[PDB]
Amino acid sequence: EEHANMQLQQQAVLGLNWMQDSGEYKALAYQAYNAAKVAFDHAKVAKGKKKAVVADLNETMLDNSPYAGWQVQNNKPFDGKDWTRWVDARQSRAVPGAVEFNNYVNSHNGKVFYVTNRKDSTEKSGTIDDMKRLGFNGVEESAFYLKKDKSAKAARFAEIEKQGYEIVLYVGDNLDDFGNTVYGKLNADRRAFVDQNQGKFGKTFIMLPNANYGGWEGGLAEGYFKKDTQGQIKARLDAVQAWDGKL
Amino acid sequence: EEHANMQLQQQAVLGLNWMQDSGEYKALAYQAYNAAKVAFDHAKVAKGKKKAVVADLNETMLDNSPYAGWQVQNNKPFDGKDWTRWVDARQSRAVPGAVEFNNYVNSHNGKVFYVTNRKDSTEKSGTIDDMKRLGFNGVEESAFYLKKDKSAKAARFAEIEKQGYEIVLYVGDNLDDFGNTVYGKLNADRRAFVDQNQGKFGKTFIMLPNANYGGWEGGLAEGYFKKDTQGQIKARLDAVQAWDGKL
Ligand SMILES: NC(=O)c1ccc[n+]([C@@H]2O[C@H](COP(=O)(O)O)[C@@H](O)[C@H]2O)c1
Ligand SMILES: NC(=O)c1ccc[n+]([C@@H]2O[C@H](COP(=O)(O)O)[C@@H](O)[C@H]2O)c1
Ligand SMILES: [Mg+2]
Ligand SMILES: [Mg+2]
């Protein structure tokens, strides 16, 4: 139903306005990357290891907000086929502070590896072209660990370690950018993971804000991503914690 | 129109789900307060000054998300009269990491002052009661600078300085928690302020995420807060930056 598709995407509007328009969002991005630089400079690795930083791409280093804007304007639920066209459009922007941090790491005895669920086979060329244009250094193909068979990222982190790197910090907008332990899990388990790692945030796990999509959306309900549009609307509304209006 | 009121509040849903349910939101809160502790510990003040931290309350130290949930469920645009009832309901929660940071500052030769637009005359008793219950130390009345005549906060910061304090850092979810220079201004000017202070974020200006309301909402359009519901809906939608769907 077109009506349900409209309601689902209207529910994204305020979060999108905040990400696209607010100074507050930019300030959070700068805060994250300022903290990331401090952590990188402090990091020491085991003898014989090279220093790596793992960075997510979408909503961490690359800004895809115009795709979300297109969803709102056209009442379109997320579809990977539309996403591939967006990537091919080569209109990605950079998250504030990301290019400077990336280039600083790469010029100060580290290497940033991009562990991202952009698709290796169909989305790599647009990604590399956009990153070059946006000013990122170190965007040769071997820096990239784009999605092949698995969306969970831990196996790619392990590949990087096998190449003689010690990962000193991770940057992401999704908890699944830090490992697999809450991949596919509901939000209660995801909050618990965060509580169990409270001291790492702003140190070895660097967070960027994303109020539009991610593992937290799936985390709203069992089987969320397999529900129809009406079901997803209901899942979102049922997750709302509301004051009853009484004293 | 009830239909417009419904659409306006539906636009808050995803941002609210993210703030209420996600582990990612909690991680951002911990990141902010972890960075805040580092900044506080590093801070030095002028001879003869006492160390102060200025903290915002709403969506910085206190979590009012159930009020937003009530808005969604009842199709209610923001109204200060409903807000006062919410405050009186004494159901505020604490933002993750806030109580620990607050109490650490207060036990380590600093003082947190609460500079907040909760209303001094009608909202103070619920605020103090909730903060005591939530575990905050230092919530005697003299720690509070609640709103009296002006929503802009700089004059209250100056009052604190006049009492012999040097403010070593500010914590907030709204850029207006850092001074008056973009108070009442549109988002372009607010983003410019952030760019002009890029290095301060995560150091002396500590940001918490708020994808639900604030100065950035008013910043969407000239005279936004005086528009009717239809006008606010249009302002939000007109602010959206959308991909045109082409390559
Ligand atoms: N609304 C959504 O669910 C939504 C929006 C944008 C991208 N995506 C997908 O999530 C992936 C995230 O990639 P990263 O791992 O680089 O953040 C994208 O490549 C895309 O496949 C999903
Ligand atoms: N949707 C809205 O505009 C909205 C929501 C919650 C609180 N408020 C107001 O904004 C103020 C913010 O207070 P702080 O300065 O402690 O963040 C509240 O006390 C209230 O007056 C506005
Ligand atoms: Mg991402
Ligand atoms: Mg606030």
XYZ file of C-alpha atoms and ligand atoms in Angstrom:
540
model
C 0.000 0.000 0.000
C 1.232 3.454 -0.998
C -0.299 4.916 2.152
C 1.742 2.615 4.386
C 4.894 3.354 2.401
C 4.252 7.067 2.924
C 3.731 6.717 6.670
C 6.843 4.567 7.049
C 9.023 7.174 5.362
C 7.352 10.152 7.042
C 8.532 8.616 10.319
C 12.129 9.322 9.198
C 11.647 13.042 8.606
C 12.717 14.686 11.868
C 15.754 12.439 12.308
C 16.740 13.222 8.734
C 16.304 16.993 9.219
C 18.534 16.711 12.283
C 21.275 14.822 10.423
C 21.140 16.964 7.277
C 20.582 20.462 8.659
C 21.665 20.723 12.292
C 24.913 22.131 13.599
C 24.475 19.673 16.479
C 24.996 16.702 14.141
C 28.203 18.283 12.773
C 29.389 18.889 16.353
C 28.866 15.208 17.200
C 30.872 14.201 14.121
C 33.729 16.522 15.095
C 33.542 15.248 18.685
C 33.907 11.661 17.484
C 36.841 12.374 15.177
C 38.576 14.600 17.746
C 38.340 11.723 20.250
C 39.489 9.262 17.590
C 42.691 11.241 16.960
C 43.514 11.256 20.684
C 42.972 7.494 20.878
C 45.095 6.859 17.780
C 47.968 8.985 19.074
C 47.911 7.173 22.440
C 47.715 3.673 20.989
C 50.617 1.264 21.241
C 50.699 -2.087 19.475
C 52.523 -5.365 20.065
C 56.101 -5.622 18.813
C 56.167 -6.447 15.113
C 52.595 -5.278 14.461
C 51.510 -2.430 12.216
C 48.888 0.033 13.522
C 45.471 -0.269 11.882
C 42.292 1.735 12.282
C 39.063 0.077 11.146
C 36.486 2.489 9.779
C 32.963 1.874 8.655
C 31.868 3.835 5.567
C 28.144 4.561 5.395
C 27.081 7.191 7.951
C 30.568 7.022 9.476
C 32.882 8.416 6.778
C 30.418 8.758 3.874
C 27.182 10.762 4.089
C 24.322 9.158 2.135
C 21.565 11.400 3.488
C 20.307 12.365 -0.005
C 19.267 8.731 -0.531
C 17.113 8.974 2.599
C 15.745 12.270 1.297
C 14.780 10.537 -1.955
C 13.023 7.841 0.105
C 10.997 10.480 1.913
C 10.051 12.311 -1.279
C 9.072 9.151 -3.151
C 7.594 7.118 -0.296
C 10.155 4.364 -0.901
C 11.089 1.746 1.701
C 14.725 0.677 1.663
C 15.611 -1.486 -1.342
C 19.142 -2.656 -2.133
C 18.465 -2.175 -5.850
C 17.778 1.524 -5.335
C 20.817 1.709 -3.052
C 23.112 0.366 -5.787
C 21.827 3.088 -8.121
C 22.472 5.694 -5.412
C 26.062 4.453 -5.051
C 26.496 4.539 -8.844
C 25.208 8.126 -8.891
C 28.510 9.210 -7.299
C 26.975 11.902 -5.101
C 28.173 10.697 -1.697
C 29.354 13.391 0.700
C 31.897 13.122 3.529
C 30.977 13.023 7.212
C 32.499 16.088 8.930
C 35.988 15.427 10.310
C 36.317 12.027 8.588
C 38.690 12.940 5.756
C 41.051 14.818 8.093
C 41.151 11.942 10.581
C 41.598 9.362 7.803
C 44.449 11.260 6.208
C 46.091 11.952 9.582
C 46.138 8.251 10.484
C 47.550 7.341 7.088
C 50.347 9.928 7.413
C 51.233 9.032 11.010
C 52.318 5.419 10.863
C 48.842 3.939 10.668
C 46.540 2.530 8.008
C 42.768 2.946 7.810
C 40.906 -0.078 6.458
C 37.347 0.448 5.209
C 35.142 -2.369 6.455
C 31.798 -1.591 4.923
C 28.633 -3.216 3.651
C 28.750 -1.425 0.373
C 28.889 -4.353 -2.049
C 32.287 -5.365 -3.425
C 30.946 -6.563 -6.771
C 28.535 -3.763 -7.731
C 29.258 -0.760 -5.488
C 33.053 -0.570 -5.347
C 33.702 1.693 -8.336
C 31.362 4.465 -7.180
C 32.746 4.221 -3.647
C 36.351 4.635 -4.746
C 35.514 7.430 -7.158
C 33.567 9.370 -4.525
C 36.263 8.893 -1.882
C 38.975 10.158 -4.225
C 36.867 13.208 -5.081
C 36.069 13.845 -1.411
C 39.785 13.995 -0.589
C 40.456 10.698 1.200
C 44.059 9.452 0.990
C 44.791 5.731 0.951
C 41.858 4.598 -1.184
C 43.671 1.984 -3.201
C 41.651 -1.225 -3.605
C 43.592 -3.124 -0.935
C 42.389 -0.695 1.761
C 38.819 -1.880 1.180
C 36.948 -4.766 2.735
C 33.555 -4.379 1.067
C 30.759 -6.899 1.496
C 31.083 -10.199 -0.314
C 29.112 -13.080 1.246
C 28.525 -11.968 4.851
C 27.112 -8.746 6.314
C 28.629 -9.502 9.727
C 32.036 -7.786 9.848
C 34.160 -9.747 12.333
C 35.627 -12.070 9.685
C 36.925 -9.044 7.779
C 38.497 -7.659 10.966
C 40.262 -11.012 11.330
C 41.559 -10.791 7.741
C 43.169 -7.449 8.558
C 44.822 -8.905 11.670
C 46.128 -11.829 9.593
C 47.954 -9.279 7.424
C 50.108 -8.280 10.407
C 48.026 -5.409 11.758
C 46.844 -4.699 15.253
C 43.551 -2.797 15.197
C 43.894 0.088 17.658
C 40.365 1.461 17.319
C 37.118 1.052 15.386
C 34.901 3.831 14.031
C 31.223 3.263 13.208
C 27.572 4.305 13.441
C 26.303 0.747 14.083
C 27.294 -1.542 16.981
C 27.872 -4.265 14.366
C 30.875 -2.156 13.297
C 32.601 -3.289 16.524
C 32.193 -7.067 16.190
C 29.592 -9.813 15.788
C 28.360 -10.373 19.300
C 25.030 -8.563 18.839
C 24.677 -9.041 15.092
C 21.046 -9.882 14.290
C 20.045 -9.395 17.937
C 17.274 -7.270 19.401
C 17.864 -3.925 21.053
C 17.871 -5.189 24.656
C 20.915 -7.362 23.867
C 22.506 -4.478 21.950
C 22.086 -2.071 24.885
C 23.583 -4.758 27.148
C 26.656 -4.981 24.897
C 27.100 -1.223 25.172
C 26.801 -1.333 28.979
C 29.387 -4.148 29.067
C 31.784 -1.929 27.118
C 30.953 1.461 28.642
C 34.566 2.575 29.059
C 35.555 1.838 25.453
C 33.301 4.449 23.858
C 35.193 7.529 22.760
C 38.399 5.538 23.215
C 38.667 2.305 21.206
C 35.071 2.258 19.881
C 34.280 5.613 18.238
C 30.585 6.306 17.583
C 28.911 8.438 14.916
C 25.173 9.230 15.155
C 22.635 7.696 12.773
C 18.956 8.317 13.563
C 17.803 6.998 10.177
C 18.689 3.286 9.831
C 20.837 0.427 11.063
C 20.962 -2.648 13.254
C 18.910 -0.751 15.837
C 15.996 -0.624 13.383
C 16.011 -4.383 12.923
C 16.478 -4.553 16.690
C 12.998 -3.095 17.239
C 11.300 -6.483 16.791
C 11.948 -10.149 16.070
C 11.990 -10.654 12.293
C 11.582 -6.916 11.660
C 13.302 -6.870 8.268
C 11.019 -9.632 6.963
C 7.807 -7.860 8.007
C 5.729 -5.961 5.451
C 5.473 -2.167 5.614
C 2.428 -2.241 7.893
C 4.280 -4.608 10.215
C 7.319 -2.346 10.372
C 5.132 0.682 11.150
C 3.486 -1.292 13.953
C 6.860 -2.470 15.281
C 8.131 1.119 15.472
C 4.991 2.391 17.169
C 4.888 -0.556 19.592
C 8.485 0.194 20.625
C 7.582 3.719 21.726
C 7.776 4.302 25.482
C 5.150 6.888 26.376
C 4.206 8.833 29.474
C 0.584 8.021 30.348
C -0.167 11.705 30.918
C -0.761 11.262 34.657
C 1.133 12.390 37.769
C -6.375 19.967 12.171
C -5.964 16.600 13.885
C -4.564 15.131 10.679
C -1.756 17.690 10.561
C -1.011 17.158 14.248
C -0.732 13.426 13.566
C 1.625 13.874 10.622
C 3.814 16.306 12.556
C 4.287 13.841 15.401
C 4.651 10.793 13.150
C 7.709 12.554 11.724
C 9.383 12.129 15.145
C 8.957 8.360 15.341
C 12.213 6.947 13.967
C 14.387 9.471 15.801
C 12.509 8.640 18.986
C 12.905 4.867 18.484
C 16.629 5.467 18.018
C 16.953 7.519 21.216
C 14.751 5.252 23.342
C 15.697 1.775 22.130
C 19.111 1.753 20.459
C 22.388 0.692 22.000
C 23.979 3.212 19.624
C 22.356 6.124 21.481
C 23.664 4.784 24.819
C 27.138 4.426 23.274
C 27.076 8.076 22.171
C 26.090 9.137 25.695
C 28.940 7.119 27.212
C 31.326 8.510 24.582
C 30.375 12.066 25.527
C 30.734 11.529 29.272
C 33.985 9.568 28.879
C 35.400 12.507 26.889
C 34.011 14.956 29.444
C 35.891 13.248 32.293
C 39.173 13.451 30.361
C 38.613 17.155 29.685
C 37.726 17.855 33.323
C 40.803 16.046 34.627
C 43.066 17.976 32.223
C 41.560 21.385 32.931
C 43.491 24.050 34.789
C 41.955 27.325 35.921
C 43.327 30.773 36.726
C 44.807 31.299 40.185
C 42.071 31.981 42.720
C 39.284 30.474 40.596
C 37.162 27.455 41.441
C 36.566 24.821 38.730
C 33.029 24.753 37.335
C 31.352 22.491 34.815
C 28.190 23.809 33.162
C 25.663 21.125 32.301
C 22.405 21.379 30.465
C 19.580 19.209 31.843
C 17.002 18.148 29.264
C 18.389 15.535 26.849
C 21.846 16.074 28.356
C 21.561 14.788 31.938
C 17.802 14.114 32.126
C 15.950 11.840 29.691
C 12.444 13.105 28.866
C 11.770 10.681 26.016
C 8.451 9.472 27.511
C 7.039 12.975 26.966
C 7.894 12.663 23.270
C 6.311 9.210 23.284
C 3.125 10.722 24.724
C 3.204 13.328 21.931
C 3.393 10.592 19.321
C 0.582 8.560 20.874
C -1.731 11.545 21.308
C -0.823 13.548 18.204
C 0.220 16.494 20.383
C 2.521 19.285 19.193
C 4.856 20.671 21.836
C 3.063 22.786 24.447
C 4.767 24.235 27.522
C 1.633 23.550 29.576
C 1.876 19.828 28.867
C 5.616 20.004 29.543
C 5.047 21.439 33.031
C 2.714 18.524 33.786
C 5.364 16.094 32.516
C 7.944 17.663 34.848
C 5.470 17.469 37.750
C 4.885 13.782 36.979
C 8.379 13.060 38.354
C 9.189 10.329 35.839
C 12.381 11.767 34.352
C 15.173 9.285 33.689
C 18.938 9.890 33.613
C 21.002 10.050 30.429
C 23.560 7.202 30.493
C 26.869 8.225 32.079
C 25.529 11.571 33.360
C 25.143 10.764 37.059
C 28.616 9.196 37.268
C 30.247 12.164 35.536
C 28.286 14.664 37.654
C 29.216 12.967 40.898
C 32.856 12.556 39.831
C 33.217 16.279 39.106
C 31.607 17.178 42.416
C 33.966 14.866 44.341
C 37.116 15.976 42.506
C 37.420 19.663 43.259
C 34.795 20.818 40.792
C 31.168 21.912 40.863
C 28.511 21.154 38.255
C 25.992 23.944 37.696
C 22.720 23.055 35.963
C 21.890 25.710 33.392
C 18.579 24.579 32.019
C 15.363 25.864 30.506
C 13.205 23.964 32.893
C 11.266 26.796 34.529
C 12.466 28.053 37.912
C 9.004 28.996 39.162
C 6.922 25.956 38.161
C 9.320 23.119 37.279
C 12.005 23.274 39.968
C 10.459 20.963 42.565
C 9.970 18.041 40.174
C 13.469 18.545 38.772
C 15.139 18.412 42.174
C 13.058 15.461 43.312
C 13.840 13.459 40.171
C 17.554 14.277 40.326
C 17.786 13.169 43.954
C 16.007 9.912 43.113
C 18.209 9.350 40.055
C 21.335 9.565 42.221
C 22.803 12.975 41.365
C 24.974 14.528 44.095
C 25.108 18.296 44.512
C 21.463 19.078 43.775
C 20.980 21.763 46.373
C 19.033 24.761 45.046
C 22.129 26.928 44.574
C 23.504 24.508 41.953
C 20.560 25.347 39.691
C 20.175 28.112 37.152
C 16.697 27.359 35.820
C 14.896 29.635 33.385
C 13.496 32.878 34.725
C 13.048 35.630 32.109
C 15.388 34.611 29.269
C 15.790 31.336 27.366
C 19.245 32.357 26.122
C 21.790 30.956 28.599
C 24.868 33.195 28.385
C 23.715 35.534 31.171
C 23.468 32.564 33.535
C 26.986 31.450 32.570
C 28.146 34.959 33.482
C 26.417 34.715 36.883
C 28.401 31.564 37.634
C 31.666 33.282 36.669
C 30.768 36.228 38.924
C 30.643 33.769 41.836
C 34.370 33.083 41.419
C 34.207 30.092 39.088
C 36.028 29.416 35.872
C 33.931 27.227 33.576
C 36.220 24.482 32.264
C 33.710 22.788 29.967
C 30.064 22.830 28.891
C 27.822 19.814 28.300
C 24.683 20.019 26.148
C 22.479 18.665 23.359
C 21.773 22.118 21.855
C 24.359 24.598 20.518
C 22.594 27.257 22.615
C 24.029 25.384 25.622
C 27.457 26.791 24.643
C 26.599 30.502 24.425
C 24.302 32.988 22.689
C 25.988 33.572 19.376
C 23.561 31.456 17.324
C 20.539 31.753 19.598
C 17.423 32.235 17.454
C 19.458 31.804 14.259
C 18.845 29.498 11.318
C 20.750 26.286 10.755
C 23.278 27.685 8.259
C 24.565 30.088 10.938
C 24.495 27.285 13.519
C 26.573 24.967 11.307
C 29.001 27.862 10.757
C 29.411 28.271 14.529
C 30.248 24.582 14.813
C 32.821 24.812 11.998
C 34.382 27.848 13.720
C 34.775 25.777 16.887
C 35.630 22.389 15.373
C 38.477 21.619 17.776
C 36.442 22.300 20.926
C 33.984 19.438 20.464
C 34.735 16.499 22.716
C 37.058 18.784 24.674
C 35.480 21.948 26.111
C 32.076 21.622 24.381
C 30.639 18.149 25.051
C 27.724 17.104 22.821
C 24.831 14.728 23.495
C 22.550 13.616 20.629
C 18.956 14.824 20.334
C 17.102 13.908 17.129
C 13.728 14.987 18.539
C 13.743 18.746 19.278
C 15.841 21.832 19.900
C 17.254 24.988 18.380
C 17.926 23.017 15.194
C 14.172 22.535 14.739
C 13.511 26.260 14.916
C 16.566 26.618 12.687
C 14.746 24.877 9.825
C 12.968 28.081 8.755
C 12.551 31.759 9.578
C 9.772 32.118 12.159
C 9.366 28.337 12.437
C 8.051 28.313 16.006
C 5.308 30.807 15.117
C 4.058 28.797 12.125
C 0.953 26.623 12.419
C 1.238 22.830 12.269
C 0.840 22.721 8.487
C 3.579 25.332 8.169
C 5.951 23.358 10.373
C 5.311 20.180 8.361
C 6.073 22.106 5.172
C 9.220 23.632 6.691
C 10.539 20.181 7.631
C 9.771 18.700 4.228
C 11.212 21.719 2.389
C 14.466 21.333 4.346
C 14.975 17.788 3.073
C 17.906 17.371 0.681
C 17.015 14.598 -1.748
C 18.817 12.698 -4.472
C 16.935 13.217 -7.748
C 17.173 9.506 -8.541
C 19.467 10.040 -11.538
C 23.125 9.207 -12.227
N 17.238 2.192 5.468
C 18.240 1.166 5.434
O 18.071 0.088 5.900
C 19.569 1.485 4.764
C 19.942 2.856 4.375
C 21.171 3.099 3.767
C 22.078 1.967 3.509
N 21.667 0.619 3.883
C 22.522 -0.547 3.678
O 23.370 -0.660 4.793
C 24.767 -0.669 4.367
C 25.636 0.072 5.379
O 26.966 0.120 4.929
P 28.142 0.393 6.043
O 28.501 -0.924 6.579
O 29.311 1.106 5.171
O 27.460 1.406 7.077
C 24.686 -0.036 2.926
O 25.760 -0.328 2.065
C 23.326 -0.592 2.450
O 23.473 -1.897 1.956
C 20.454 0.374 4.519
N 9.473 19.535 21.144
C 10.034 20.645 21.860
O 10.164 21.721 21.377
C 10.470 20.420 23.301
C 10.560 19.073 23.892
C 10.967 18.917 25.215
C 11.291 20.115 26.010
N 11.167 21.435 25.401
C 11.491 22.664 26.121
O 12.869 22.894 25.978
C 13.501 23.012 27.290
C 14.895 22.391 27.265
O 15.469 22.444 28.547
P 17.103 22.322 28.659
O 17.621 23.685 28.506
O 17.320 21.682 30.136
O 17.490 21.292 27.496
C 12.449 22.318 28.236
O 12.519 22.672 29.596
C 11.132 22.732 27.543
O 10.754 24.025 27.937
C 10.790 21.595 24.072
Mg 27.583 2.508 8.674
Mg 18.839 20.269 26.542
